[PDB]
Amino acid sequence: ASTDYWHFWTDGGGIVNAVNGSGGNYSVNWSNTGNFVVGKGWTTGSPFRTINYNAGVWAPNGNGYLTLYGWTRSPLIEYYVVDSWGTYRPTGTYKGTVKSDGGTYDIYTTTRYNAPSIDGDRTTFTQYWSVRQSKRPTGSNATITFSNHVNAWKSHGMNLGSNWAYQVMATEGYQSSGCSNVTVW
């Protein structure tokens, strides 16, 4: 089904202006920020979901990610499928690659310690990353077949939690400014 969840979070640094638009459309306009995540998607994430989006505006000036973003519990996992970015390409511990939706993605893990999560501010958890080897073109309808990433991650020994939290097509930024506009379905 279509999106049912609006995600807006900022660490308080700088200015993050977001619009919860009609349907699955949203926009972000940010300046000299700390860390923030804004997106639309689903209250309950699914490993079988194919996420559709169209990024009509993708204009980070500095570190911003255009990314599928979500969490699981049992175990606690923060996951990313990064289609585009700004000045910084996110990486971690290299695992391998996956080909999905016309792109090749590098697979990474990063375990974080005494770190903020949906479960507290000093928790331990692993990030699962799929990061496109080159920036995906924006402005046309795009698909993220999330089951391909779940499958490849599992093949590399990266198991997701059994309890699913939110799952969104997000704009994340850190120490940056920028203009963004995305429709998700």
Curated annotation (Swiss-Prot):
Active-site residues, record numbering mapped to chain: 78 (nucleophile), 172 (proton donor)
Molecular-function annotations in GO: endo-1,4-beta-xylanase activity
Catalytic activity, as annotated: Endohydrolysis of (1->4)-beta-D-xylosidic linkages in xylans
BP-aspect Gene Ontology terms: xylan catabolic process
Listed SUPFAM superfamilies: Concanavalin A-like lectins/glucanases
Gene3D superfamilies to which the protein is assigned, alphabetical: 2.60.120.180
Entry annotated with the keyword Transferase: no
Consequence of substituting residue 78 to S: Drastically reduced activity
Outcome of swapping residue 172 to S: Drastically reduced activity
EC number: 3.2.1.8
UniProt keyword terms in alphabetical order: Carbohydrate metabolism, Glycosidase, Hydrolase, Polysaccharide degradation, Signal, Xylan degradation
Domain GH11 per the UniProt entry, residue ranges: 1-185
Pathway the protein takes part in: Glycan degradation; xylan degradation
Similarity remark: Belongs to the glycosyl hydrolase 11 (cellulase G) family.
Protein name stated in the entry: Endo-1,4-beta-xylanase A
Lineage: Bacteria, Bacillati, Bacillota, Bacilli, Bacillales
